[PDB]
Design a protein around this nucleic acid. Structure first.
Lengths: 104, 92, 97, 78, 99, 84, 93, 108
DNA sequence: ATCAATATCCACCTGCAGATTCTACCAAAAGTGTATTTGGAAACTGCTCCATCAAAAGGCATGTTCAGCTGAATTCAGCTGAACATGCCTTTTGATGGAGCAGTTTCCAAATACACTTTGGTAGAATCTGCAGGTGGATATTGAT
DNA sequence: ATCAATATCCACCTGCAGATTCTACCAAAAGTGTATTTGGAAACTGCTCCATCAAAAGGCATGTTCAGCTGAATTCAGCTGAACATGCCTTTTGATGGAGCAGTTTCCAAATACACTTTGGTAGAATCTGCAGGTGGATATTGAT
């Protein structure tokens, strides 16, 4: 039975291990590397997905659209940092008007 | 014959938010996220392997790559999950 | 007749377009501009419909982010109106020039 | 074609940026920045087409050229 | 008499002077101990190749000089000649250092 | 050894105004020297953070110049002249 | 020990362009890093190209596309020219 | 047994083509390396080395000195348009800056 | 700040279409099992190279005084860009059909990879020799009458 | 429009730290001889992509009116620059202790390499959330006692 199950993960450890061999990253790839890595991606997906779902139901919707992802990443401080040089397609911007720009 | 991560993104979505779905554009946003991160982590680990004249990438390389690549509390939380997955895998 | 004081509709437009994620440039004048630029680089080309979409997405996401930084420069000079002086300071700091 | 990018379209783009008013000299400067951007990205993208011995610029090529310039884009494959 | 220079004349001198040279402007001992503190209060009980503190100071001064340039451009943009904090946080905001 | 304490004040005010000259600056507000120190520390922090992280992965106890360079590259401030 | 660098080949090219001009050790370091920096940018960019196109081998064609991508304007064509020249000179004899 | 010709000579190159070939294989850029790649690369690097060197030794002569110090290198790369552009996110140790005072800051 | 008169949102429903989700089978990977290689971890250990010290000097930091002008605060007017009704045209869209073209196999010749059998390159002495650092007149440059 | 004060530029020297050259070892190309791929070279599909073609709908261009923003002009408190005295603490130099890098062996634990014996992609049915309007009631805005 699957290596991903042995690790107790939803992300494919086997596929990731092939992606590291076919990826021209190192001559040989250890057996613990793809497991570790697949868990990290699974987690980071979860943390974005959770914050997206919160942003999704906070908007009365049950289906996560990209706008919910942009809100989820830009309102989170450390995800905005990790994905700063990144554009979310169909994401828009957070509503932000400068104070100086506001009416009397 | 093009493969993606959308199967596993959906499992993880139904895990955290069993009540919530996801649109197709948003699913491509996710795949791309997975892929981008994957490159960052793997390249940084490959460069770690070379800088120290090692030829194999171990889970250790991937960890130091995560500490270098992931800011603050994302780092500690992410380091944990892998060491958790490596330990649970190795046990049996 | 009734009229809205100047600047009011401006903030109204700001609050609408920040609320949405629609593409703001008309699709064909853009696509026409894209293929024109491609011609000047290579002839008889073809774009996936999703490739012009990608360029339009990347391009409005670039310009909107620039206008964010441009506005900050207009505010830094005790002004409220973005000028070509502001876009140049913005890009000269970013490293694009 | 650069004038196809109408002034109101530029004006909306500034609005999403949180801009209150626009000096008339902007719209030209905006079109110049817009072109240099499309120029730099499409060149790098077209190069990725020509290396593949293809005649159809795929959305991927654009993604790679965007990454190339440090404007990485999620949502269009890779 | 005694002689005096009109305020602003010595700086133009100072700009011309340090733009013509390449020496490191921070004194080396205070920068070295500053590095050891930042490192000590990160991972206790470390050592440093002398060339590593050099490379740090080189990259540091190079960074700060380029920050001042970008800062001064913001001060000029505000019809001032004096660089203020207000300018630096702007320069670093656009730079993406912390927008 | 001796306790290492408040060494950001070793970055003198004259040393800061010198760095400001070479950057083309004529008049320096009075508040600049604190902001400068604040930004330099955040800078040095982030680089020494990564430099040491390379030292740790190498199982080394001395921070090599190459560690500093791999760090500066990562942050983006690629440096020429040390360890290639 | 045995630490290799490009100091031999930088110095050969220095005597070629400026037969009367020497180079300091610090400046040779700046160069050895420059050769290495470019070498990594090009090779990495070609590594990416071959990987994008599902080809397991890096030909000199990949390097040329890398050179076009990285080098700006005239530096690119002047380079591409010099490269192709050295390749055809190599394969011929 | 025939006489050995350095690959760098065969391509008319000063830069080491055999060494560039090794550094492409042991660098993990692809599983296999074509035989024209190390040549084509060593040529490009040699070209760029030559370009930088000519502009520096020029500025070395302008400063009345016969030995290139990193100051001249920084003067060369920053005063040339494309070199500065290629080396934007790049700092030269002991490099200094190009003298550049703003117009507004000059005396009345 | 209220009293009105527009024009603007914003709450609450609602039936439907375009996508989303769930279903049925199919190669392509992934996992086992077995048999080799082999990378790097452990264990000394030689030895750069780093940490520390002392002692003297003189470079430079610090703190204080003084004030020239720079930043800020105020006023005002000309004129630029916002608002707006309006008149038309370029974009949208919805196929529809035609074909150039990315994508897939099936060979194979040519190009690479290994696997071992002669210098170019590097690490040191051993010589060379730019120029750093110190002086002083020539020459500006600056600022006070 | 001068005329000192003072700083700068620049030519001259010359021992020396640092380059350049000379010299033995040796890691690494080079050269040959097979064992594998590998990516074209043609041969052919099914996609997608271009091309009109043809209504209508917003959407854009335009011109007029003027509200209020920007830029100029003026004024002044006070901040920050310029000078100078003062004396600290950085710099310089030269020597040592020994830590801990880094060069060598030795040898299991672990990764690799085929050989054979389920999951994920893909293209259809069965839902199904949001769209996109439509009144209807506060909401925000702006003009007038």
């Amino acid at each position: 039975k699957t290596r991903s199950s042995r690790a107790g993960l939803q992300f494919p450890v086997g596929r990731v291990h092939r992606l590291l061999r076919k990826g021209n990253y190192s001559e040989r790839v250890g057996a613990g590397a793809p497991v570790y890595l697949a868990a990290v991606l699974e987690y980071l997906t979860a943390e974005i997905l959770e914050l997206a779902g919160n942003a999704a139901r906070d908007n009365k919707k049950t289906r996560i659209i990209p706008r919910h992802l942009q809100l989820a990443i830009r309102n989170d401080e450390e995800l905005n940092k990790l994905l700063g040089r990144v554009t979310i397609a169909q994401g828009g911007v957070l509503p932000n008007i400068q104070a100086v720009l506001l009416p009397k | 014959r093009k493969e993606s991560y959308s199967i596993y993104v959906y499992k993880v979505l139904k895990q955290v938010h069993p009540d919530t779905g996801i649109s197709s554009k948003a699913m491509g946003i996710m795949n791309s996220f997975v892929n981008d991160i994957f490159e960052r982590i793997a390249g940084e680990a490959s460069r770690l392997a070379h800088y120290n004249k090692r030829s194999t990438i171990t889970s250790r390389e991937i960890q130091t790559a995560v500490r270098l690549l992931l800011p603050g509390e994302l780092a500690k939380h992410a380091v944990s999950e892998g060491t958790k997955a490596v330990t649970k895998y190795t046990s049996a | 007749p009734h009229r809205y004081r100047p600047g009011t509709v401006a903030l109204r437009e700001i609050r609408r377009y920040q609320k949405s994620t629609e593409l703001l440039i008309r699709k064909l004048p853009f696509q026409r501009l894209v293929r024109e630029i491609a011609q000047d680089f290579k002839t008889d080309l073809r774009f996936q419909s999703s490739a012009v979409m990608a360029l339009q997405e990347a391009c409005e996401a670039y310009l909107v982010g620039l206008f964010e930084d441009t506005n900050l420069c207009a505010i830094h000079a005790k002004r409220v109106t973005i000028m070509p002086k502001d876009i140049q300071l913005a890009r000269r700091i970013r490293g694009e020039r | 074609n650069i004038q196809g990018i109408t002034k109101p379209a530029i004006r909306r783009l500034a609005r999403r940026g949180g801009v209150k008013r626009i000096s008339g000299l902007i719209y030209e400067e905006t079109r110049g920045v817009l072109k240099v951007f499309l120029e730099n990205v499409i060149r790098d993208a077209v190069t990725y087409t020509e290396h593949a011995k293809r005649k159809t610029v795929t959305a991927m090529d654009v993604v790679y050229a965007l990454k190339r310039q440090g404007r990485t884009l999620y949502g269009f494959g890779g």
